[PDB]
């Protein structure tokens, strides 16, 4: 049984990770971290998921949360995750990073930390999205830039980052298929533009509303036809279980920065 | 069979109107009017659409164009449309007005002319778009603002306006339903922002690619359910189809100033 | 805060109702009623949903369940619901009835009891599903039958009914709008047929796969345009949310027999 | 310039083929066939597409239509197309068959005729659908039968055959990815069924209405997620131009029965 610590524990994904660890025999909940000053500090982890007593006391202290564990499961917030990757480097812990919305400097620091430990970082832990990204790359290679690539997503009202990490991951697969660089061709929010569409660009549109877990669609819009490739997440458990799969894969793996592709195949 | 005159005939909807009238038995093209000094004056109407000879000689004289007709189909210019509405009042002709850009004074005159004849005036003449707008307004009134309103549209690569005019029309339907002002609550391209969504706002997302004629979708996204209302345009001829419905509905209707909501039976 | 009793509590919507009431401040669980001799009698209501102790002891006595409450939330059985409607009439309690299968006599009695209290009765209690039905009926009336009506739904692999009950409800909305009888115009699975589509029919296509909670889409497909009206369910809790809206709306409303259309403001 | 004859000339696809041949320099309209007793017989082909005089007189006689030509372009009706494939065999003409809805015997006869001439037969002439079929095969191989495959399509009110030929082609790609046989696992119209879904089956749902040129969607519905792959045809010109591309490819090719995959790559 792998011993795992859940950070951002009171968040949507945090609670979902605790629920998933509890229903499985192959992973063990050994610590739960929340922010300093949280009313959950000192309570039993059971309170986060309405379960039976777990015998795991919630802490706000990373030293405590990380003292007797084999891995960190982290869907939280970008500044927090860089901080936890440093702890992961210092203490030689595996770090599963689901968090999205990192800057370039943050990503550079996470790469530094991957020199000292094993880190699986991915903007989507689901099997379906990782297959979709592959299909989008093949599509973007088979269809030349007479087919305009346009990426749409919808998520719940409280999502902080846009485009989603999944959208960016899908855009990067499309850019690879086209042998171009995403940063050179991406256009966020055509809604706030005037002009002819520029050929070869990849557009991003994003809706935010209600409680939607996550829809993503990539349209290839050519002359009198469209190919549309899509993914619909029904619930967050798919990402919780992808993270657990990544933890188990990382356990005795060598140091480095890895993706769900590495975990899955693929 | 209803006799119709198409005005602004070398302009935006003129060819579509003439094409649509030519293929139906229930409407008859009896006149075609163009701007003063047009190359098309004195040519047969067939030259505008590449058909066989139609027996209708294009004119730039409104006196001739309206001399023996039952309705005016008009997607031209505001000042021309006020003039033609006066002809419609004087001669008891129905007037389908798809023109946009009217001043307040011009709108008051059109209201005057509606005392004497039947006028149907709408900036968008698609049966489906006007239906959708009405359903959107109804949904926006029925659902509290714990249902978030997000509006999406997709159009061909070369489209200039963004968001589309139809998106804006749909947005204004939602704002009306919610008793708020579109201009205070609208957010364009959440893609280019960070942070939680602000309550009661209406988002607009726009996609541009390929040759898409026009898709519009309004999502009402609430607690664990969504309602999604969409219009998918296949051909630009839909605006001529609606204009003709409006003409046929207007023919023996009582005088007044009407919209496509009236043509659809939605008041 | 409105005090509510959940009946049929070990049955279909009972747990969802209790869960939904527990997480809100504006409604208070004051009683829980189960069938005579249930294992759950005398247990705390928490045992039904695995929460902490709620201070509400489950009973099988309607006299106790209705002794000090303001409304009855009821997704149980017809004969029980008629009885509870009598309690609601005698005690001036609102009654939200999601029960189905009533006889004509039972429906007449419920109509009697609505002279003395406020009853909201609908076979489906989702705010979004009832809205959608209304918009479908409006669209079916507004668009002539040169717009073809096709109904699609998708549900999880294990779903028994096909087409879904919600699909049938939506179909009946369309039939009403068109002034026709669903049973004469419905076509199930055009997949298993050959030949042109017959005018005025309403088609039903059903997909089964995976864990999908329930997607429904109505297409009105006319000459070169389509209108598409959809409901997407995320969680089964939507039926409890609607039932609670109905309860809150019913509380100080005048007596009568109402539907979710009334709760939504759509008459 | 390749000399081509259009059969089923007054049909939707027939007219579209004539329009496409006329706008191109590399193909030449040399004959136009309609049914016996059609009012179009003896008129100039221009009447079918509202063009300028083409100097091609419409005939109802196959002997005449097929006497001085290099190929037959055929989107018509299954009995008619088997008849024309026989003429194609007898006269050594290439035959591009877009028609769908063939029985097994009809398909067996078309295979016989392919011994004597070159026949490209395909239920969809568009580039997008042939790429989509490939993506569906890869998807169906990457995702095991915990992902339920469900195919949906919508076409105009007057379409005769259901499911569409495109739906069947997509179902066959899915069956190959799953290493199963379509005929063993297909279920048409679940609407008229009661029961649990049977594992490994591929379902087909079809709407018919208005003027829709053709939408197709393949859903892979797993545990708490769906992948959906789709194609939207905007107009019939894409199929007319795919047929012309097939004619040009078939011109000096050896005898046999071929698909748009062969024409395209692919
Ligand atoms: N890769 C994937 O498959 C996947 C799937 C789903 C979501 N995501 C991503 O995962 C992230 C979290 O999503 P979510 O919806 O669960 O967000 P959420 O509900 O907002 O959860 C955020 C959690 O992070 C904690 N946190 C933030 N800053 C912190 C700090 N400085 N120190 C300690 N704790 C801190 C929050 O605590 P407080 O409550 O104290 O603020 C909270 O527990 C997002 O970036 C999202 O895009 C990824
Ligand atoms: N592979 C593709 O990419 C593709 C694309 C589009 C359509 N399709 C398929 O192509 C076929 C035609 O589609 P469509 O919409 O063009 O159909 P349509 O408009 O009904 O055209 C049918 C044509 O076939 C003619 N025809 C039928 N039986 C005949 C006979 N016994 N002898 C002579 N002529 C005969 C008809 O003549 P009358 O008017 O005299 O009956 C008409 O000209 C369908 O099977 C459709 O599924 C394939
Ligand atoms: Cl998220
Ligand atoms: Cl003009
Ligand atoms: Cl019970
Ligand atoms: Cl077809
Ligand atoms: Na465990
Ligand atoms: Na006419
Ligand atoms: Na409560
Ligand atoms: Na040519």
Q: Which residue of A has its CA nearest to C210?
A: A234
- Can you tell me the distance from the alpha carbon of A225 to that of D126, in angstroms, rounded to the nearest whole number? 9
How far is ligand 6, taken at its centre, from the CA of residue A11, in Å? 50
* CB-side neighbour CA atoms (13 Å) of B92: 4
Q: Give how far the C-alpha of residue C110 lies from the chain's centroid of Cα atoms, to the nearest Å.
A: 17
The SS3 of residue B33 is strand
A231-262 CB burial, b ≥16 within 10 A, e <16 = bbbbbbbbbbbbbbbbbbbbeeeeeebbbbeb
Does residue A124 have its Cβ closer than 6 Å to ligand 1?
yes
CA C36 to chain centre: 25
* Planar angle of CA B248, B250, B251, nearest 5 degrees: 70
Q: Is C122 annotated as a binding residue?
A: yes
Most A-contacting residue of C18, C155, C234, C236 (CB-CB within 10 A), to test interface: C234
The DSSP-derived string for B132-195 is HHHHHHHHHHHS-TTSEEEEEEEE-TT--SSS-HHHHHHHHHHHHHTTS-HHHHEEE-GGG--S
Find the radius of gyration of the CA atoms of chain B. 20
Give the H or E element holding residue D182.
helix D182-185
Alpha carbons B240 and B233: distance in angstroms, whole number: 13
Task: Report the CATH fold assignment for B1-126+235-267.
Answer: Rossmann fold (3.40.50)
Instruction: From chain C, pick out residues whose CB is under 8 angstroms from the CB of B222.
Output: 127-128
D163 inside 8 A of chain C by CB:
yes
Instruction: Tell me the shortest Cα–Cα distance from D227 to chain B, in angstroms.
Output: 20
Residue A159 Cα to ligand 3 middle (Å)? 6
CB–CB contact D207 C205 (8 Å): yes
Six-digit token pair at C93?
Answer: 């309690």
Please report, in angstroms and rounded to a whole number, the separation of the first and last CA atoms in chain B: 28
Nearest-neighbour CA in chain A from C90: distance (Å): 39
Q: Can the peptide bond before residue C163 be classed as cis, meaning omega within 30 degrees of 0? A: yes
Give the phi and the psi of residue C157 in degrees, each rounded to 5.
-60, -35
Sheet of strand A27-32: strand arrangement? A27-32, A2-6, A71-74, A94-97, A118-121, A256-258
Determine contact, residues D234/A224, Cβ cutoff 8 Å.
yes
Q: Return d(Cα D252, Cα D164) in angstroms, integer.
A: 31
Q: Do C224 and B230 touch (CB under 8 A)?
A: no
Query: Any idea where the domains of chain C sit in the sequence?
Result: 1-126+235-267, 127-234
What is the C-alpha to C-alpha distance for residues D239 and D166, in angstroms, rounded to an integer? 12
Residue from B84, B143, B151, B89 nearest B116 by CA: B89
String of DSSP letters for B57-86? B-BS-HHHHTTT-SEEEE-S-HHHHHHHHH
Exp. method: X-ray
Q: Own/partner pairs for D183-186, CB < 8 Å, 24+ apart? A: none
Return the sign of the alpha-carbon dihedral for residues D249, A139, D140, D234: negative
Q: What is the signed CA dihedral for A57, A62, A68, A70, rounded to 10 degrees?
A: 110
| D14, D39 contact by CB (below 8 A) | no
| Structure-token match 């302009």, residue found | B11
Query: What residues pair up with A188 in beta bridges, in sequence order?
Result: A204
Instruction: Determine contact: D211 vs chain B, CB below 8 A.
Output: yes
* CA C86 to centroid of chain Cα atoms: 21
Could you tell me which of D217, D145, D124 has the C-alpha nearest to residue C205? D217
Q: DSSP secondary structure string, chain A?
A: -EEEEESSTTSHHHHHHHHHHHT-SSEEEEEEB--TT-TTTTSBGGGGTT-S--S-B-BS-HHHHTSS-SEEEE-S-HHHHHHHHHHHHHHT-EEEE------HHHHHHHHHHHTTSEEEE-S---HHHHHHHHHHHHHHHHS-TTSEEEEEEEE-TT---SS-HHHHHHHHHHHHHTTS-HHHHEEE-GGG--SPPPTT-EEEEEEE-TT--EEEEEEEEETTEEEEEEEEE--THHHHHHHHHHHHHHTTPPSEEE-HHHHH--
**Cα–Cα dist B233/B126, whole Å:** 9
C-beta of residue A153 within 8 angstroms of C-beta of residue A164: yes
CB C14 within 8 A of CB C48: yes
Residue nearest to atom 9 of ligand 2 (CA): D99
CATH of domain D1-126+235-266: 3.40.50.720
Q: How far is the C-alpha of D137 from the C-alpha of D261, rounded, in Å?
A: 14
**Among 3.40.50.880, 3.30.360.10, 3.40.190.10, 1.10.630.10, what is the CATH number of A127-234?**
3.30.360.10
Tokens at residue C4, please? 């509510």
**Are C159 and C206 spatial neighbours (Cβ–Cβ below 8 Å)?**
no
Segment (H or E) for D229: strand D225-233
Alpha-carbon Rg for chain A in angstroms: 20
Beta bridge partners of B207: B154
Instruction: Write the secondary structure of chain C as one string of H (helix), E (strand) and C (coil).
Output: CEEEEECCCCCCCHHHHHHHHHCCCCEEEEEEECCCCCCCCCCECHHHHCCCCCCCECECCHHHHCCCCCEEEECCCHHHHHHHHHHHHHHCCEEEECCCCCCHHHHHHHHHHCCCCEEEECCCCCHHHHHHHHHHHHHHHHCCCCCEEEEEEEECCCCCCCCCHHHHHHHHHHHHHCCCCHHHHEEECHHHCCCCCCCCCEEEEEEECCCCCEEEEEEEEECCEEEEEEEEECCCCHHHHHHHHHHHHHCCCCCEEECHHHHHCCC
Tokens of A246: 């990544």
d(CA A110, CA A84) in angstroms, rounded, equals: 10
Rounded distance between C-alpha atoms, residue B87 and residue B89, angstroms: 5
Contact between C250 and C258 (Cβ < 8 Å)? yes
Distance CA D87, CA A93 (A): 75
Residue to substitute in A33, A35, A60, A166 for testing ligand 1 pocket (most ligand atoms within 8 angstroms of CB): A35
The verdict on whether omega for the bond into residue C179 sits within 30 degrees of 0, i.e. cis, is no
List, as residue ranges, the binding site of B for NADP(+): 35
Q: Which residues of C are identified as catalytic?
A: 155, 159
Q: Which subunits count as partners of chain D given 3+ CB pairs below 8 Å?
A: A, B, C
Q: Please indicate whether residue A183 is annotated as part of the active site.
A: no
Tokens 């190929």 belong to residue: D71
Residue carrying the six token digits 């942070």: B195
- Answer whether A205 sits within 8 Å of B195, measured CB to CB: no
C-beta of A12 in contact with ligand 1 (< 6 A): yes
Q: What are D43's two structure tokens?
A: 């008129």
Bridge pairing between strands A202-208 and A148-155: parallel
Burial per residue of C93-128, b for 16 or more beta-carbon CB atoms within 10 angstroms, e otherwise: bbbbbbbeebeeebeebbeebbeebbbbbbbbbbbb
Q: Which residues pair with D32 in a beta bridge?
A: D6
Q: Which residue has tokens 């959208």? A: A167
Collapsing DSSP states into helix, strand and coil, what is residue B89?
helix
Q: B110, B48, B124: which is closest to B79 by C-alpha? A: B110
Residue whose CA is at the smallest distance from ligand 2 atom 20: D11
**Contact of B245 with B127, CB cutoff 8 Å:** yes
Residues facing residue B73 across a β-bridge: B6, B96
Contact (Cβ atoms closer than 8 angstroms) between residue C203 and residue C152: no
CB of D242 closer than 8 Å to CB of D125:
yes
Tell me if residue D165 falls in helix, strand or coil: helix
Q: Which of B186, C233, B218 is nearest to A211 (CA)?
A: C233
CA–CA gap between residue D17 and residue D263 (Å, rounded): 18
Give the residue among C223, C108, C231, C117 at the shortest CA–CA distance from C167: C231
Sign of CA dihedral C188, C190, C191, C194: positive
Name the nearest CA neighbour of A40 among A23, A56, A60: A60
């Amino acid at each position: 049984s792998m011993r795992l610590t859940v950070v951002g524990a009171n968040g949507r994904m945090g609670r979902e990770l605790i629920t998933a660890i509890q229903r499985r025999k192959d992973v063990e909940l050994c610590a739960v971290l929340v922010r300093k000053g949280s009313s959950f500090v000192d309570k039993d982890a059971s309170i986060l998921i309405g379960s039976d007593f777990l015998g795991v006391r919630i802490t706000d202290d990373p030293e405590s949360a990380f003292s007797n564990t084999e891995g960190i499961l982290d869907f939280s917030q970008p500044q927090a995750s860089v901080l936890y990757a440093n702890y992961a480097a210092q203490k030689s812990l595996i770090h599963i990073i689901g968090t999205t919305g990192f800057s370039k400097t943050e990503e550079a620091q996470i790469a530094d930390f991957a020199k000292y430990t094993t880190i699986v970082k991915s903007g989507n832990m689901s099997l379906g999205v990782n297959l979709l990204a592959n299909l989008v790359k093949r599509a973007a290679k088979a269809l030349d830039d007479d087919f305009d690539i346009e990426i749409y997503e919808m998520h719940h009202a409280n999502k902080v980052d846009s485009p989603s990490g999944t959208a960016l991951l899908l855009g990067q697969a499309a850019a690879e298929g086209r042998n171009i660089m995403l940063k050179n061709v991406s256009v966020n929010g055509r809604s706030g533009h005037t002009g002819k569409r520029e050929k070869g660009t990849i557009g991003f549109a994003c809706s935010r509303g209600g409680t939607v877990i996550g829809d993503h669609s990539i349209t290839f819009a050519g002359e009198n036809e469209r190919i549309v490739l899509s993914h619909i997440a029904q619930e967050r458990s798919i990402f919780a279980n992808g993270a657990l799969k990544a933890a188990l894969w990382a356990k005795n793996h060598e140091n480095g920065l890895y993706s769900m592709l590495d975990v899955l195949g693929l």
